[PDB]
Amino acid sequence: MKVEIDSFSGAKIYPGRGTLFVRGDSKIFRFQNSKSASLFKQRKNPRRIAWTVLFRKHHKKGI
Amino acid sequence: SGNGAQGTKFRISLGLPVGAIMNCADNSGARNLYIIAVKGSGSRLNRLPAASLGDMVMATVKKGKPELRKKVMPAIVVRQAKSWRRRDGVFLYFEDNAGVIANPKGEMKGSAITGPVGKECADLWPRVASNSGVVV
Amino acid sequence: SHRKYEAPRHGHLGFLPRKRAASIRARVKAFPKDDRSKPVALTSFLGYKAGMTTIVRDLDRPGSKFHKREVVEAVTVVDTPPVVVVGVVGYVETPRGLRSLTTVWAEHLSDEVKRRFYKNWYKSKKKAFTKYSAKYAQDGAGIERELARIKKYASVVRVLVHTQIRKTPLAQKKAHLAEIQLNGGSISEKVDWAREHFEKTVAVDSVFEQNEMIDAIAVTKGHGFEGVTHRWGTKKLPRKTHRGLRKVACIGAWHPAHVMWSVARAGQRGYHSRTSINHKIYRVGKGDDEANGATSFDRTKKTITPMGGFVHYGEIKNDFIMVKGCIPGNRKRIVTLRKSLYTNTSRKALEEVSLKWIDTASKFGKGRFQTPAEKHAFMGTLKKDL
């Protein structure tokens, strides 16, 4: 078992779930589901999306 | 696909039918590869022969050095951009469509590869694996 | 003149007619060859298809480029509470075929199988098998007379079972009754085995085991009247086509001056009896066994039910079979699981499966948590009260 992390949302990626993306600079991205993959493709900033893990620590919520 | 391959390839989703134009990933001179045929492709009425990652294809060069243009040469697809599933359950894809010019025996005409290379292509073609850098 | 271009036929001619099934319980049309040396066991079982989920396991097959590596595979889980044996039917051999010679029923029948004999249960006086139950009354001599006939005659012996659908989250309230052939033993042992199991349940672990190929026999999912494009996979006509393009352009030559039985035509899609073979059992689970979903590698005390339940079925509170891949039919549907009619030695069989992980994330969306405790740990305490 290797549970991955969402590159956009900090979500647990269990085997089979979501999609892996390889960028032109050969940088791997992993998305738990197509909600996070689409927001990444639209170039949304994960630090400004209120439910992503990157946002939650940036605003110190549930400390 | 075809002859020269170092083993078998588990099925990859086809995303590159004939008439597709994919990038050239090597320093051979070509800047694009126009797929005209897929090696080891079946016959079905009105179905386009379609390539996948690691497939030997027959291609022409549309944009590139004039000495490579107006000829049919073999090529190996190294990036797909069509989502496909590996047997460990992961669906992955690249940004673009990339290939490298090869000969029928499978060895690479250029000496380097620009960008990531699919693992299935590297495993099946040892000469692509030698000239590849990062792999997925 | 000729086609000008060869192509394979569309659709399979051996699966005709593409008509609705006669019953919602697809019948077993063949049982495995009997070798009478083994003990008396069942040749098939009844189940309700709960749904599908995901596993991870290590592949064990040399030669493959995923050997000794974690592969991800789809499984379907079927709810199998034990079947209650309530009858036995003797089948004599005849120059016209098998023929039921007589039937013997258990003295007590539950209401869940009594309902099977009624169209309007709620209005009736519930008189089914009331006079027959008086054939065991004095000393059961008449019952013993019938069982002896099955011993003397009846070269083929089949037992009658009904499901315990009360222990299932179906609204049906009415059990499914079926004939299951008895293999192993001779005719006398088969009759004695049936007699001793009257009114007693039979667990699924006694007939099935892990890593064996079994067949599914179910009616597929119904779709109603369907056109020829999605019923037979025929080419859609060009965009320019007047008076319809989801059709077959030429439905026959001038001669013979008839439409052929082999031309694709619109009609019913789905709700057909189908028998698919070679489904390996990946886990024979147990009902009163918390950590059904745990494996040797997980140790998470979780059952097989996905988080929030099986969508459109409910929870699995009984035993279950868990076979690799997909079986015909949809959720909530009575399915018959049958042992293989031949010995498979493919090396895709004969290989022991050890599960490394079972998915229990919700199938009602993009479930991102396997258990409520996992969701609680990742997400923390919420506003919703405790």
Added chain:
RNA sequence: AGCCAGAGGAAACUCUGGUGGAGGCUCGUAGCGGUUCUGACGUGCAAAUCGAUCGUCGAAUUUGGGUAUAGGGGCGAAAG
């Protein structure tokens, strides 16, 4: 086009910024047409229509009414 201011140049002369508002110009409504879908309909809404897409849109324009030309005759930017 006409007109005003300015600049360069030894002379010829050249240039710039404004003004003005021309044209069987052009984009495009109403209007007048009727290209394509060879779409709809094709015992129709209709013995020629409907929908989209189109041509033109200040004049060789469109149009009402009055009036003239009548059958080997009329009328025709011409298709019998």
Added chain:
RNA sequence: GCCAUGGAAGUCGGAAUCCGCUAAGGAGUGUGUAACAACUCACCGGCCGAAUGAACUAGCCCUGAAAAUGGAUGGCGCUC
């Protein structure tokens, strides 16, 4: 047996095919040998014991004799 063949000496190729012994034995029918050889055949007998060989002639049957919806001595069927 003569040439010729590294090598053919009945058996690549040419070429001849005489009579002594004879119940029979041809410088040859073949297998053949690197080549003879050896074996086999033509021929002869101390061995059997009923017909055999060649050419043809025509009766029936068979081969020659391949089409497209399933099918037609009328059908079933029929073999001293």
Added chain:
RNA sequence: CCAAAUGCCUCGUCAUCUAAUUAGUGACGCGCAUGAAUGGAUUAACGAGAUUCCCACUGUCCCUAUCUACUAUCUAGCGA
């Protein structure tokens, strides 16, 4: 001026365009049967004219799936 909306032979020959071109373009010209107001050659701009190629773009297609509205469906009335 030309294998042209005119050339039968003809898919003329050569070049270019393509992986491949009876298409397109550029050349050649004894041209069945081009050619000078029965107007010749050219020509900016214009064209719902005919034709070829390229970029963009896409369900035209690979390869089809899904959704909506109105039908079709069943019912009452009406009814060719």
Added chain:
RNA sequence: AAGCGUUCAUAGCGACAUUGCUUUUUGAUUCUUCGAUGUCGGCUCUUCCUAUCAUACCGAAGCAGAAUUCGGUAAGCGUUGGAUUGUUCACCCACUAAUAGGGAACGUGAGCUGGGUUUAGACCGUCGUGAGACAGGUUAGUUUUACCCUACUGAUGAAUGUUACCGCAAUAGUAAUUGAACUUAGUACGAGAGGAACAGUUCAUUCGGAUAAUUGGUUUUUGCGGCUGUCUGAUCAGGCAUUGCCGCGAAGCUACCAUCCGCUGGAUUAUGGCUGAACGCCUCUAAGUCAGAAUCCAUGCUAGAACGCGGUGAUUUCUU
């Protein structure tokens, strides 16, 4: 069978002659249709033939291996993607195991399309004094109707004493297909150059039957959020914009765009054999008989005869 094939008619061919078959050519005929059988081609789809391109099993060779060639049974199963052309035909590019030939009113226009031919408009060239002609070129040019019967695809259904459940199986259909790579093995074979096959495994091609855990697609979940314009005095909350638009979007449906699954027994064809006469020998054949094909029949799978059948439960009064 004169010759070719180093010698050698018949491995493979084969002159001079001669015997046929076929009706996918074109002629020839004018029997049917002129109170009309819609006309070329292509698309779509089914089935049939075998004169077999491939695949199975074989026989032969001027078959060492490899690759080929000839021939047998065999139509079970496949026989493609493109440039040009309306094209049938043709030609080339390329993949492939192979890109075989045909038929079905030159299959198939109330299935399509309408590029061509083949109405009326127009231009050219040649011919004609002219009107005009051209199986010469060019361009534009309405493709109608099924609701009837049958057929086919699905779907009900009277009658069986009633009703219910569990079953049998006559008949009919039937399905899987082909390649690569590793190993065998650089092995046999060959002087070398080259270079196999059987068994084993891993995959793939084409077809089929399902299924929806995942991934993708779809969105009237008008579920949530956002945005424009306008209206409800503002706020909140909404209406309208023929589904206003954008992003996400469960459920459901669905994709070689996803995954799973696709059985084994017998009898045979060609052929090779055994025993064994005819014919004191020989001989696969005459009597017997062995093995043996992608064949056939079953196992299996689908339907279940609505005029085939079996077992089993209950069978109506305080009810003219």
